[PDB]
Design a binder for this molecule. Structure first.
Ligand SMILES: NC(=O)CN1c2ccc(c3ccccc23)N(CC(N)=O)S(=O)(=O)c2cccc(c2)OC(=O)CCCCC(=O)N2CCC[C@H]2C(=O)Nc2ccc(cc2)S1(=O)=O
Length: 274
């Protein structure tokens, strides 16, 4: 009965809408206190947090509670982080990368909801604005992005405080939807400098290889989450228009299938499931 929340986005949007893949119903919920695009979403203990983005870049961390349909302010990050990416480990929110104006972040900071406190951790090997982030059994991955100059590179964070480069992708991707499904890390979509991508690669943590799976039906700044063993990508920008298209990836048949449409097109959204 879990839901897919899309929060904020760009058409900078305040919408918080929830999709049920089991019946095609959308619900519109309480707005983001402050519109934001370029933000990330993630869930801790049933709570949905919206991080970073921009309205002016944003350091805001807000918390949405399905049980109250109310957005609660949290302590802000140590710096603004637009085009951020986030992951959770042990109930802690890791916010990696992003940009504050011309400052392209390689720093990473961790929020403990228990104390409402943000705290710095070991920065990355590379500045990554538009970074993709996912976590696989307490390893945090930052994938792609753009360092202020040039990334196919990916790197991995072990919490117990050092980042390690991993195998590079087959593709240069900033603004790529990144997730973990099963024991693999997916990097769907992105922007290679030239084109929006519809291709998707997954890193098998156990063969340390990026292999392409079927292409999507193109997009950047797309939302991405998992729901009932399936990847859902939301909206994004295909180079010409801001898509309302929501696409679902079934790993069993290795196909991407459009599965719904958002009530309005957006990119720059934060997405999570709870
Ligand atoms: N919160 C934000 O900062 C804003 N948003 C973001 C914008 C960017 C990245 C974002 C990545 C992650 C999350 C959010 C991203 N990326 C760079 C990165 N290092 O990751 S990106 O994914 O690679 C990418 C997306 C879209 C366009 C693009 C590159 O550049 C291009 O293709 C140029 C092609 C022609 C379009 C164009 O001329 N335009 C002139 C200005 C903008 C863009 C525009 O007209 N409308 C627009 C408005 C809002 C958004 C996208 C497009 S947004 O809200 O999603």
């Amino acid at each position: 009965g879990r839901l897919i929340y899309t929060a904020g986005g760009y058409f900078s949007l305040s919408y918080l809408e929830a999709y049920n893949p089991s019946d095609g119903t959308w619900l519109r919920l309480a707005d983001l206190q402050v519109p934001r695009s370029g933000l990330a979403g993630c869930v801790v203990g049933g709570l949905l947090y919206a991080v970073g983005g921009r309205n002016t870049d944003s350091s805001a961390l807000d918390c949405y509670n399905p049980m109250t349909n109310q957005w609660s302010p949290c302590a802000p990050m140590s710096v603004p982080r637009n085009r951020i990416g986030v992951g959770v480990i042990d109930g802690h929110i890791y916010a990696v990368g992003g940009s504050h104006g011309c400052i392209h972040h390689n720093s990473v900071e961790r929020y403990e909801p228990e104390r409402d406190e943000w705290h710095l951790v070991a920065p990355m090997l590379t500045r990554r604005i538009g970074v993709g982030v996912a976590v696989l059994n307490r390893l945090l991955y930052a994938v792609g992005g753009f360092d202020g100059t040039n990334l196919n590179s990916a790197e991995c964070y072990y919490p117990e405080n050092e980042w390690r480069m991993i195998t590079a992708m087959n593709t240069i991707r900033s603004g790529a939807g990144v997730c973990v499904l099963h024991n693999c890390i997916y990097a769907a979509g992105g922007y290679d400098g030239q084109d929006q991508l519809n291709s998707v690669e997954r890193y098998d943590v156990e063969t340390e290889t990026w292999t392409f799976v079927a292409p999507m039906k193109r997009r950047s700044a797309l939302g991405i989450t998992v729901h009932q063993g399936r990847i859902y990508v939301l909206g994004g920008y295909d180079g010409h228009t801001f898509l309302d298209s929501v696409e679902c990836y079934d790993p069993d048949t290795d196909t991407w299938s459009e599965v719904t449409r958002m009530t309005s097109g957006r990119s720059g959204v934060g997405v999570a499931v709870t």
